[PDB]
Amino acid sequence: ACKEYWECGAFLFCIEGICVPMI
Numbered sequence: 001a002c003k004e005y006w007e008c009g010a011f012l013f014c015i016e017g018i019c020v021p022m023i
Contacts, residue, residue, distance in 0.1 A: 002014040
């Protein structure tokens, strides 16, 4: 995932640096 996992939170999908919730 993204480098800083905690930036996204708990399990997110990264799209160009943006951590979005995966469907």
